[PDB]
Ligand binder design. Structure first.
Ligand SMILES: N[C@@H](Cc1c[nH]c2ccccc12)C(=O)O
Ligand SMILES: N[C@@H](Cc1c[nH]c2ccccc12)C(=O)O
Lengths: 499, 498
């Protein structure tokens, strides 16, 4: 057995890794986390619950401390018809007589948004409902993402810095050694493996396995071990962002969802926290400058509020060829990053950590096990990359240079067959990206249909079938929607009850 | 819309197609079936088909000499006299790792006895239902894609009787039955089938033609020139000999199929209500049909020359495309592999369910047709890989046949799977990645049963508290104990539904 893990870098990636290792292995692993002093709101997947449940944490403990909110999905607005929107929900499509509701909607639906017809979540979001009743009841242990069965109906918005601080307390309580210091040199042995990290004030910190959580820097994985970073700039050019913290005047405006609003040269997130929104404009500097993007952001969400400070960021978009090199594993932005259009950041960290426990090394290091880990991590990001490019290709707007350039930009290899297929009929389990990338079929279909990649006609089988069962299911969805919105409290109301 | 479907060939494939089309489309499709004038096993997911049709097993199973299947018993593939079960049961998961992984770490009792209730159910010859009909553990109109929980059993049946049953169902619902021989299959100037010319009923025309003519491939191969891809290079078994053996003692009836490794192939045992079907699948490169029949008889019915042996040649592989122009092959005409994992009915079911999903309009969209072909190809290719893994895992090396199995070429995707399997267990991300009727537990159960075992257990397990896993092993044993005491025998339950 190996004995010791050294994690370099804190934040979400570092403290998720530290807390998880201690939850998995307790006192059968030694963990040190080294982070520098020289260092906004985020969304998650519904599946982050597996992580928190694995640690033994309940949302009533941490969510309020972390300014938290509930996320029922993402509202996409202004990507195609001006002022139109639809939701991408944490909700699977129902299946009637062997065909999902999206297939039926093409045949017998009211061709308003697909999402209004097909998902309860649409109308919950329009009514701004919480996913729990005042008594805590939902409207609908140690496990991992692989144990996802039923689609859990919500995820979280939170201040990720507060979450990281919360997890640091947990991890340190469980025996993680916390060192605040700068790494001045990374030592290697004769095989090129990492032998230790040399710190300004704590000398050399050594261990069996090193975890690189140094973010875009990639201090270990790129700067030391020569890992090759593969940029996605050719297919996804957005390289910068500018963000604002906007206090909420009226509490009941709190949305139980993330919004992704297409802008002149990129898109804007709105992440509703308890008492404020975080807004961020993600853009390509080929088409707009930082000053212009700040101006557009401000005009949209906070006109006249020069008291509110903007924060500017540059992003490294892509993935490392391998995230595990020798005795070093990259987790978080050091490993890979895509723009947060589908809230994938925390998911990438979670899957990397859960798979690190699964592929944890013995004293005899195993190149076959390591290769399987590297393949899984590459598939994860590459699948998401393809899915994200389909957003830009499906968007129907062509009003600015950015949006015109989106139409004709290069695209991933596999995405041609998918676009070909999607002109004829809906994608399904067998024709979406075939390896685990955190999304299922309904997510691919929903973005296509919402944006406007629609099949030319409905599936011919449906013209031969009795439409009554499907029509009845559309009616059930409307009625269940009606009942749920009358019964549930608002997002703010519920959160306020648990503060 | 197209209007009419002509099915050429009866049997399981033809009548499953005929009945499903009428179930799916009722009076919005015209269907005609033209046909000329032992025992089989299924997957648990065949229930999606029967439920779609609206049939309850208590109607048809007794009429089809039926039995229940909890899985397959694999015997004598590796150490002489050793066996294990491949069940209709998923592995439990504790603290993020399945019971096979924990078994490697804190186990050694065979893998299948420790990990699956099914093992001891089979050893005790239990039925999966209590006499009141309750399951030990209606789908309406659903398909294979709607499989969620693992349903715990499948069927053994007389497939001729199932075809007969379905024929009655289909004809009652408006299917036109024509008993005659096809003399000529007509084609138009584009090479699309125009009609089938019969001896006594003239030309039977339609919009869509379904080839259910078996290994013949009368439409898809002989008429349309479809290319057939043989698997003989990786799966050389090309013939079978079968015998029906009446069962003397009712209580000997097993709730499972047996696959017994033989000198130059393997033998199936399929238990029906009053008899077993036994068949030796072999390669004629290694044993003659006369020798094969002698070995089968010595194994299951020595001195029973009153029982007639039936000899069969098999066409092993798949059509490159099962849908060409206005013709779709279903069953043996489309593809066939040896019945080592009971795939024959599943291949028919999937092809039919996907034909409904990919049903053509008058425009005959080629993208929709292309998609169907791709699904059908992956279905069989995945099963191809899984089956070759059986022969590669088998440890016996005692005859020319088994020695040849060790060094025979394999499909290219299998090398990686073998290299992984030497190190750790396969999982959802490393088995064959497209739908092929089997999930991760099936791949790992065959590996661990046959002997492709990781060098060492998953290192992470040595860092973890083993109590939860040991408690789950204990639950499995105790649940097994309770169930074998509570459940009736396979025969008893079946007697009770006749
Ligand atoms: N499949 C993931 C992510 C996801 C599902 N639906 C979504 C809607 C929006 C954003 C992410 C998602 C989950 O179940 O949690
Ligand atoms: N996956 C199929 C087939 C299957 C599962 N377990 C099996 C055991 C033996 C033979 C086939 C199977 C099913 O669930 O029904």
């Amino acid at each position: 057995m190996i004995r010791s893990v050294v994690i370099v870098g804190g934040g979400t990636a570092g403290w998720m890794t530290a807390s998880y290792l201690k939850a998995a292995f307790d006192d059968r692993i030694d963990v040190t986390l080294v982070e520098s002093g020289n260092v906004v709101g985020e969304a998650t997947f519904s599946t982050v619950r597996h992580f928190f449940d694995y640690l033994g944490l309940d949302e009533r403990e941490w969510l309020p401390r972390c300014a938290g909110g509930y996320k029922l999905g993402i509202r996409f607005e202004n990507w195609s018809e001006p002022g139109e929107y639809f939701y991408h929900p944490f909700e699977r499509l129902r299946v009637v007589d062997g065909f999902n509701m999206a297939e039926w909607w093409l045949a017998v639906g009211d061709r308003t948004s697909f999402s209004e017809a097909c998902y309860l979540t649409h109308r919950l979001c329009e009514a701004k409902r919480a996913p729990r009743m005042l008594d805590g009841s939902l409207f609908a242990g140690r496990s991992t993402l692989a144990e996802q069965r039923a689609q859990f109906p919500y995820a979280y918005h939170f201040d990720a810095d507060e979450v990281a601080r919360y997890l640091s307390e947990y991890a340190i309580a469980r025996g993680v050694r916390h060192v605040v210091d700068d790494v001045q040199h990374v030592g290697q042995d004769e095989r090129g493996w990492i032998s230790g990290v040399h710190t300004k004030q704590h000398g050399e910190i050594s261990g069996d396995l090193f975890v690189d959580c140094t973010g875009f820097r990639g201090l270990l994985i790129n700067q030391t071990l020569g890992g090759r970073f593969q940029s996605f700039s050719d297919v996804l050019p957005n390289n910068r962002a500018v963000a604002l913290r906007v206090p909420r005047e009226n509490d009941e405006d709190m949305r139980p969802y993330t919004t992704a609003t297409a802008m002149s040269a990129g898109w804007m997130w709105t992440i509703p926290l308890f008492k404020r929104d975080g807004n961020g404009y993600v853009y390509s500097d080929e088409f707009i400058s930082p000053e212009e993007a700040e101006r557009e952001l401000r005009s949209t969400v906070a006109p006249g509020r020069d008291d509110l400070e903007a924060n500017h960021i540059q992003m490294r978009i892509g993935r490392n060829e391998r995230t595990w090199i020798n005795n070093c594993v990259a987790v978080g932005l050091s490993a890979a990053f895509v723009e947060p259009l589908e809230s994938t950041g925390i998911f990438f960290i979670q899957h990397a950590i859960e798979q690190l426990v699964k592929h944890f090394p013995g004293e005899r290091w195993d190149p076959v096990l390591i290769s399987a880990y590297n393949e899984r991590m590459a598939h994860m990001v590459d699948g998401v990359k393809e899915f994200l490019v389909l957003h830009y290709k499906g968007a129907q707007r062509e009003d600015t240079p950015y949006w015109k350039a989106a139409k004709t930009r290069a695209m991933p290899d596999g995405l041609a067959r998918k676009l070909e297929l999607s002109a004829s009929h809906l994608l399904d389990e067998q024709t979406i990206y075939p390896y685990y990338h955190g999304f299922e079929t309904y997510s691919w279909i929903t973005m296509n249909l919402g944006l406007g990649i629609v099949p030319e006609r409905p599936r011919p089988a449906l013209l031969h079938m009795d439409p009554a069962p499907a029509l009845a299911e559309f009616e059930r969805l409307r009625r269940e929607g009606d009942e749920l919105i009358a019964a549930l409290p608002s997002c703010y109301e519920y959160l306020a009850s648990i503060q």
